[PDB]
Design a protein around this motif. Sequence first.
Motif, PDB file in Angstrom:
ATOM      1  N   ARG A 139       0.862  -1.323   0.122  1.00  0.00           N
ATOM      2  CA  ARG A 139      -0.009  -0.011  -0.005  1.00  0.00           C
ATOM      3  C   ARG A 139       0.912   1.148   0.175  1.00  0.00           C
TER       4      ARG A 139
ATOM      5  N   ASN B 176       1.214   5.265   1.326  1.00  0.00           N
ATOM      6  CA  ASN B 176       0.688   5.833   2.193  1.00  0.00           C
ATOM      7  C   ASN B 176       0.952   7.269   1.984  1.00  0.00           C
TER       8      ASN B 176
ATOM      9  N   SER C 290      -0.542  10.432   3.356  1.00  0.00           N
ATOM     10  CA  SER C 290      -1.533  11.091   4.411  1.00  0.00           C
ATOM     11  C   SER C 290      -0.946  12.082   5.157  1.00  0.00           C
TER      12      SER C 290
ATOM     13  N   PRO D 126      -0.212  13.611   8.784  1.00  0.00           N
ATOM     14  CA  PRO D 126      -0.046  12.786   9.970  1.00  0.00           C
ATOM     15  C   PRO D 126      -0.783  13.595  11.363  1.00  0.00           C
ATOM     16  N   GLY D 127      -1.279  12.772  12.181  1.00  0.00           N
ATOM     17  CA  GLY D 127      -1.740  13.421  13.258  1.00  0.00           C
ATOM     18  C   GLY D 127      -2.336  12.062  14.139  1.00  0.00           C
ATOM     19  N   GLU D 128      -2.969  12.592  15.360  1.00  0.00           N
ATOM     20  CA  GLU D 128      -3.668  11.411  16.025  1.00  0.00           C
ATOM     21  C   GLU D 128      -4.719  10.870  15.219  1.00  0.00           C
ATOM     22  N   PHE D 129      -5.631  11.645  14.229  1.00  0.00           N
ATOM     23  CA  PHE D 129      -6.374  11.029  13.322  1.00  0.00           C
ATOM     24  C   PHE D 129      -5.744  11.411  12.056  1.00  0.00           C
ATOM     25  N   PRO D 130      -5.029  10.710  11.400  1.00  0.00           N
ATOM     26  CA  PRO D 130      -4.682  10.792  10.042  1.00  0.00           C
ATOM     27  C   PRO D 130      -5.467  10.883   8.938  1.00  0.00           C
TER      28      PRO D 130
ATOM     29  N   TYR E 125      -6.173  10.693   5.092  1.00  0.00           N
ATOM     30  CA  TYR E 125      -5.738   9.910   3.907  1.00  0.00           C
ATOM     31  C   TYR E 125      -6.127  10.081   2.654  1.00  0.00           C
TER      32      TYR E 125
ATOM     33  N   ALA F 211       3.160  -0.506   4.816  1.00  0.00           N
ATOM     34  CA  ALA F 211       2.904   0.470   3.665  1.00  0.00           C
ATOM     35  C   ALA F 211       4.243   1.315   3.527  1.00  0.00           C
TER      36      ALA F 211
HETATM   37  C1  LIG Z   1       0.424   6.147   7.291  1.00  0.00           C
HETATM   38  O1  LIG Z   1       1.323   7.238   7.683  1.00  0.00           O
HETATM   39  C2  LIG Z   1       0.787   7.875   8.759  1.00  0.00           C
HETATM   40  C3  LIG Z   1       1.968   8.894   9.288  1.00  0.00           C
HETATM   41  O2  LIG Z   1       3.050   8.322   9.345  1.00  0.00           O
HETATM   42  C4  LIG Z   1       0.715   6.893   9.953  1.00  0.00           C
HETATM   43  O3  LIG Z   1      -0.064   7.639  10.924  1.00  0.00           O
HETATM   44  C5  LIG Z   1      -0.193   7.152  12.348  1.00  0.00           C
HETATM   45  O4  LIG Z   1      -1.601   6.863  12.567  1.00  0.00           O
HETATM   46  C6  LIG Z   1      -1.222   5.897  13.910  1.00  0.00           C
HETATM   47  C7  LIG Z   1      -2.716   5.570  13.952  1.00  0.00           C
HETATM   48  O5  LIG Z   1      -3.245   4.761  12.755  1.00  0.00           O
HETATM   49  C8  LIG Z   1      -0.798   6.873  15.086  1.00  0.00           C
HETATM   50  O6  LIG Z   1      -0.910   6.124  16.040  1.00  0.00           O
HETATM   51  C9  LIG Z   1      -1.478   6.524  17.324  1.00  0.00           C
HETATM   52  O7  LIG Z   1      -0.172   7.423  17.749  1.00  0.00           O
HETATM   53  C10 LIG Z   1      -0.442   8.249  19.084  1.00  0.00           C
HETATM   54  C11 LIG Z   1       0.727   9.104  19.512  1.00  0.00           C
HETATM   55  O8  LIG Z   1       1.572   8.105  19.886  1.00  0.00           O
HETATM   56  C12 LIG Z   1       2.817   8.358  20.366  1.00  0.00           C
HETATM   57  O9  LIG Z   1       2.879   9.194  21.435  1.00  0.00           O
HETATM   58  C13 LIG Z   1       2.359   8.383  22.563  1.00  0.00           C
HETATM   59  C14 LIG Z   1       2.696   9.524  23.820  1.00  0.00           C
HETATM   60  O10 LIG Z   1       1.773  10.772  23.568  1.00  0.00           O
HETATM   61  C15 LIG Z   1       1.115  11.067  24.403  1.00  0.00           C
HETATM   62  O11 LIG Z   1       1.976  11.252  25.928  1.00  0.00           O
HETATM   63  C16 LIG Z   1       2.867  12.124  26.021  1.00  0.00           C
HETATM   64  C17 LIG Z   1       3.629  11.765  27.281  1.00  0.00           C
HETATM   65  O12 LIG Z   1       3.843  10.527  27.672  1.00  0.00           O
HETATM   66  C18 LIG Z   1       2.385  13.284  26.237  1.00  0.00           C
HETATM   67  O13 LIG Z   1       3.136  14.229  26.240  1.00  0.00           O
HETATM   68  C19 LIG Z   1       1.571  13.563  24.797  1.00  0.00           C
HETATM   69  O14 LIG Z   1       1.046  15.060  24.743  1.00  0.00           O
HETATM   70  C20 LIG Z   1       0.439  12.554  24.330  1.00  0.00           C
HETATM   71  O15 LIG Z   1      -0.716  12.786  25.343  1.00  0.00           O
HETATM   72  C21 LIG Z   1       3.314   7.307  22.946  1.00  0.00           C
HETATM   73  O16 LIG Z   1       2.909   6.381  23.988  1.00  0.00           O
HETATM   74  C22 LIG Z   1       3.506   6.613  21.348  1.00  0.00           C
HETATM   75  O17 LIG Z   1       4.410   5.500  21.746  1.00  0.00           O
HETATM   76  C23 LIG Z   1       4.000   4.075  21.924  1.00  0.00           C
HETATM   77  O18 LIG Z   1       3.716   3.573  20.689  1.00  0.00           O
HETATM   78  C24 LIG Z   1       5.340   3.319  19.896  1.00  0.00           C
HETATM   79  C25 LIG Z   1       5.178   2.724  18.658  1.00  0.00           C
HETATM   80  O19 LIG Z   1       4.402   1.328  18.783  1.00  0.00           O
HETATM   81  C26 LIG Z   1       6.407   2.849  21.113  1.00  0.00           C
HETATM   82  O20 LIG Z   1       7.597   2.657  20.294  1.00  0.00           O
HETATM   83  C27 LIG Z   1       6.308   3.277  22.336  1.00  0.00           C
HETATM   84  O21 LIG Z   1       7.080   2.331  23.085  1.00  0.00           O
HETATM   85  C28 LIG Z   1       4.840   3.427  22.905  1.00  0.00           C
HETATM   86  O22 LIG Z   1       4.374   1.990  22.851  1.00  0.00           O
HETATM   87  C29 LIG Z   1       3.825   7.348  20.220  1.00  0.00           C
HETATM   88  O23 LIG Z   1       5.443   7.704  20.434  1.00  0.00           O
HETATM   89  C30 LIG Z   1      -1.446   7.466  20.097  1.00  0.00           C
HETATM   90  O24 LIG Z   1      -2.339   8.702  20.618  1.00  0.00           O
HETATM   91  C31 LIG Z   1      -2.097   6.437  19.669  1.00  0.00           C
HETATM   92  O25 LIG Z   1      -2.495   5.613  20.601  1.00  0.00           O
HETATM   93  C32 LIG Z   1      -3.950   5.072  20.338  1.00  0.00           C
HETATM   94  O26 LIG Z   1      -4.173   4.088  19.709  1.00  0.00           O
HETATM   95  C33 LIG Z   1      -3.789   2.724  20.013  1.00  0.00           C
HETATM   96  C34 LIG Z   1      -4.053   1.566  19.195  1.00  0.00           C
HETATM   97  O27 LIG Z   1      -3.977   0.439  19.641  1.00  0.00           O
HETATM   98  C35 LIG Z   1      -4.182   2.374  21.483  1.00  0.00           C
HETATM   99  O28 LIG Z   1      -3.686   1.351  21.860  1.00  0.00           O
HETATM  100  C36 LIG Z   1      -3.851   3.595  22.371  1.00  0.00           C
HETATM  101  O29 LIG Z   1      -4.435   3.112  23.848  1.00  0.00           O
HETATM  102  C37 LIG Z   1      -4.566   5.009  22.003  1.00  0.00           C
HETATM  103  O30 LIG Z   1      -5.913   4.641  21.817  1.00  0.00           O
HETATM  104  C38 LIG Z   1      -6.485   5.825  22.413  1.00  0.00           C
HETATM  105  O31 LIG Z   1      -6.498   6.715  21.569  1.00  0.00           O
HETATM  106  C39 LIG Z   1      -7.040   7.005  20.408  1.00  0.00           C
HETATM  107  C40 LIG Z   1      -6.604   8.032  19.440  1.00  0.00           C
HETATM  108  O32 LIG Z   1      -7.671   9.026  19.719  1.00  0.00           O
HETATM  109  C41 LIG Z   1      -8.532   6.894  20.743  1.00  0.00           C
HETATM  110  O33 LIG Z   1      -9.254   6.978  19.662  1.00  0.00           O
HETATM  111  C42 LIG Z   1      -8.792   5.667  21.524  1.00  0.00           C
HETATM  112  O34 LIG Z   1     -10.110   5.517  22.028  1.00  0.00           O
HETATM  113  C43 LIG Z   1      -8.043   5.631  22.894  1.00  0.00           C
HETATM  114  O35 LIG Z   1      -8.641   6.507  23.899  1.00  0.00           O
HETATM  115  C44 LIG Z   1      -8.861   5.764  25.077  1.00  0.00           C
HETATM  116  O36 LIG Z   1      -7.793   6.397  26.026  1.00  0.00           O
HETATM  117  C45 LIG Z   1      -7.585   7.889  25.834  1.00  0.00           C
HETATM  118  C46 LIG Z   1      -6.702   8.198  26.813  1.00  0.00           C
HETATM  119  O37 LIG Z   1      -5.193   7.522  26.540  1.00  0.00           O
HETATM  120  C47 LIG Z   1      -8.813   8.470  25.988  1.00  0.00           C
HETATM  121  O38 LIG Z   1      -8.628   9.986  25.085  1.00  0.00           O
HETATM  122  C48 LIG Z   1     -10.010   7.867  25.056  1.00  0.00           C
HETATM  123  O39 LIG Z   1     -11.266   8.667  25.598  1.00  0.00           O
HETATM  124  C49 LIG Z   1     -10.136   6.480  25.299  1.00  0.00           C
HETATM  125  O40 LIG Z   1     -10.474   6.253  26.824  1.00  0.00           O
HETATM  126  C50 LIG Z   1      -1.650   5.638  18.282  1.00  0.00           C
HETATM  127  O41 LIG Z   1      -0.717   5.092  18.740  1.00  0.00           O
HETATM  128  C51 LIG Z   1       0.413   7.490  14.718  1.00  0.00           C
HETATM  129  O42 LIG Z   1       0.504   8.661  15.540  1.00  0.00           O
HETATM  130  C52 LIG Z   1       0.467   8.205  13.350  1.00  0.00           C
HETATM  131  N1  LIG Z   1       1.661   8.573  13.045  1.00  0.00           N
HETATM  132  C53 LIG Z   1       2.136   9.936  12.703  1.00  0.00           C
HETATM  133  C54 LIG Z   1       3.388  10.178  12.421  1.00  0.00           C
HETATM  134  O43 LIG Z   1       1.280  10.793  12.734  1.00  0.00           O
HETATM  135  C55 LIG Z   1      -0.158   5.858   9.641  1.00  0.00           C
HETATM  136  O44 LIG Z   1      -0.338   4.726  10.472  1.00  0.00           O
HETATM  137  C56 LIG Z   1       0.257   5.193   8.185  1.00  0.00           C
HETATM  138  N2  LIG Z   1      -0.748   4.013   7.793  1.00  0.00           N
HETATM  139  C57 LIG Z   1      -0.272   2.791   7.172  1.00  0.00           C
HETATM  140  C58 LIG Z   1      -1.381   1.799   6.826  1.00  0.00           C
HETATM  141  O45 LIG Z   1       0.886   2.583   7.477  1.00  0.00           O
END
Ligand SMILES: *[C@@H]1O[C@H](CO)[C@@H](O[C@@H]2O[C@H](CO)[C@@H](O[C@@H]3O[C@H](CO[C@H]4O[C@H](CO[C@H]5O[C@H](CO)[C@@H](O)[C@H](O)[C@@H]5O)[C@@H](O)[C@H](O[C@H]5O[C@H](CO)[C@@H](O)[C@H](O)[C@@H]5O)[C@@H]4O)[C@@H](O)[C@H](O[C@H]4O[C@H](CO)[C@@H](O)[C@H](O)[C@@H]4O[C@H]4O[C@H](CO)[C@@H](O)[C@H](O)[C@@H]4O[C@H]4O[C@H](CO)[C@@H](O)[C@H](O)[C@@H]4O)[C@@H]3O)[C@H](O)[C@H]2NC(C)=O)[C@H](O)[C@H]1NC(C)=O
Length: 513
Positions: free
Chosen positions: A231, A233, A235, A237-241, A243, A344
Amino acid sequence: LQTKQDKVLAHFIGNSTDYFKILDHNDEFVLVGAKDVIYNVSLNGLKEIARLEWHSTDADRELCALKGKHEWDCHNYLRVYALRPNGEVLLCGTNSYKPRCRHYTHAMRYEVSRDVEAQGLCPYSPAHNSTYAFADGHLYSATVADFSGGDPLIYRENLRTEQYDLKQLNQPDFVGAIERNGYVLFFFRELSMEVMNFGKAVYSRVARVCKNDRGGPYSHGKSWTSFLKARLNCSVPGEFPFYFDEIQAISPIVESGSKSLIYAVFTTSVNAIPGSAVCAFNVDDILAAFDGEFKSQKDSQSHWLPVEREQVPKPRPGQCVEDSRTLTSIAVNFIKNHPLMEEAVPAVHGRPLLTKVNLHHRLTAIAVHPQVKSLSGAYYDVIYSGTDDGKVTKFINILSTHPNSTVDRLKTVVISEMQVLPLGTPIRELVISTSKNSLVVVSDGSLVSVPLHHCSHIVDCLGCLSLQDPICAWDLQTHECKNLATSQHKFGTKTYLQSLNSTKKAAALLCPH
Ligand SMILES: *[C@@H]1O[C@H](CO)[C@@H](O[C@@H]2O[C@H](CO)[C@@H](O[C@@H]3O[C@H](CO[C@H]4O[C@H](CO[C@H]5O[C@H](CO)[C@@H](O)[C@H](O)[C@@H]5O)[C@@H](O)[C@H](O[C@H]5O[C@H](CO)[C@@H](O)[C@H](O)[C@@H]5O)[C@@H]4O)[C@@H](O)[C@H](O[C@H]4O[C@H](CO)[C@@H](O)[C@H](O)[C@@H]4O[C@H]4O[C@H](CO)[C@@H](O)[C@H](O)[C@@H]4O[C@H]4O[C@H](CO)[C@@H](O)[C@H](O)[C@@H]4O)[C@@H]3O)[C@H](O)[C@H]2NC(C)=O)[C@H](O)[C@H]1NC(C)=O
Ligand SMILES: *[C@@H]1O[C@H](CO)[C@@H](O[C@@H]2O[C@H](CO)[C@@H](O[C@@H]3O[C@H](CO)[C@@H](O)[C@H](O[C@H]4O[C@H](CO)[C@@H](O)[C@H](O)[C@@H]4O)[C@@H]3O)[C@H](O)[C@H]2NC(C)=O)[C@H](O)[C@H]1NC(C)=O
Ligand SMILES: *[C@@H]1O[C@H](CO)[C@@H](O)[C@H](O)[C@H]1NC(C)=O
Ligand SMILES: *[C@@H]1O[C@H](CO)[C@@H](O)[C@H](O)[C@H]1NC(C)=O
């Protein structure tokens, strides 16, 4: 007149029924496959040089009309050209839904050396859903094999993708084919299986085949043993990318420094707000995706992870083996069962180079003038993009290092957006001739030549700096906006002014009062 109309230099006009298609081009001559005709057109004045006409027999058109197609469909739209290694010329056309291929051999020579079926090698309809690529003396075609349009395939020398198998191809619309490093890459959009509920979502893919593929053993002798896809990609980037999942066009491989790039145009699906984007992909990143894990077969649970590392066959699938007929049935069936890679392909800079959202037009075409040297000395790719509206957008990208925070910011310097075609007509293709400073816009029934760079067309200093084209600079000695690539500066460029890393109003401030 909300957008200014560009200065049309030359025009090559045919009927709207012609459905033009560019078959081959260089800096001086371009081939245009049309209805019943293929044209050899010079690029200096868009004047016709050589014409080759090829019409469907009344027997062919009658059966075509008997098949239930309209008059405009029952013609011979030429769609495939290739200069064979023998010096011969290969020509294939739709021929009123009876596709055929032919070999040919001041002076215009038109001797029919061969005439044979083109089923699977040439499309049936003028619809721009299919592409091809002539690599190492063979034709790698991606089209439909049936008259109804329900049998998509990728074919070459009696090697085809699995018929009626949706894991390899699922109603694909092809947009291009590029040869690279012993592979042939195909770019297309198709329906998605990897979604949990098998919902009708379109995803953009890049697929590859080994050119040295000889098929597999026994019943696998007519099918690929090296077909893989991943695939793309594109898109934001963001919390909700956000595409852009429907690719629309690609450019040839661009050489930007040590990196080989492919620029592509993406649009959003019908539900997401109308949006268009331009993404660039590194060829080394595309080829690297096929070294990763394989997405497991869509089991009934559909939550399955990539295939276990110990389950992949003894040689890695997709690795170009010398004689693929020696591969085992278990190894060939595996790559037929898992043609989709888990990861991707990421875009360069991880975000689109240009986005167009909530606008009354979509991007349709793409072309690049690579490595334009700016007055400062840095090299920028000038990217050209066309719309279904008929507009053309020039822009370059500037990446800032520590401007405010450690996060890099990528900005888009829009050079110009001008109306080229009539406000209704859409832009099908874009051809760039750098030596003649000519951008050739291609519609269904016309070729239009507009200047590639408007340096010689602007007389004001404020406009020369506000344009922010890396190739135009303002000479203070002679009040003339000069082209840095074509115009000769024997006295040097020390008296020149250019500002690309500023606001369009901040640039005009550098211009004298
Ligand atoms: C195409 O390319 C694009 C662009 O590159 C790719 O885009 C990516 O898309 C994915 C999703 O598809 C995104 O993933 C999400 O990432 C964010 C951010 O993660 C990072 O930051 C985390 C910490 O941030 C928070 O904490 C710090 C302090 O700690 C704080 O300062 C900051 O302000 C913020 O508050 C890190 O923890 C995280 O690291 C983790 O992952 C790493 C990689 O695996 C790993 O190395 C680390 O060790 C660690 O394990 C990272 O650095 C996340 O917010 C988000 O997480 C959600 O989704 C996962 C999915 O399983 C879930 O387990 C999580 O619990 C979390 O789910 C909550 O949030 C959802 C997001 O809104 C929400 O919808 C859910 O309902 C759930 O919410 C529940 O809990 C919350 C409270 O936590 C509450 O609000 C809700 O009401 C509910 O109770 C994802 O991981 C990528 O960010 C993004 N990439 C980029 C660059 O943008 C795309 O993937 C590509 N596509 C393809 C097909 O390849
Ligand atoms: C579309 O129109 C243009 C305009 O004519 C046309 O470009 C021309 O291509 C031909 C080749 O097809 C060029 O003519 C060649 O010139 C070279 C000089 O370097 C000759 O060596 C060539 O001879 C070939 O064949 C010889 C034996 O027959 C060999 O000994 C030799 O090695 C060559 O293989 C040939 O005369 C011509 O110069 C250009 N014209 C211009 C203005 O550049 C184009 O081919 C047309 N058709 C398309 C693109 O399909
Ligand atoms: C284009 O269409 C017109 C119909 O008005 C027709 O007369 C003309 O012959 C067509 N062009 C060519 C090259 O046949
Ligand atoms: C293009 O090819 C695909 C391949 O399956 C086919 O389904 C489609 O009908 C063809 N035409 C268009 C306009 O997509």
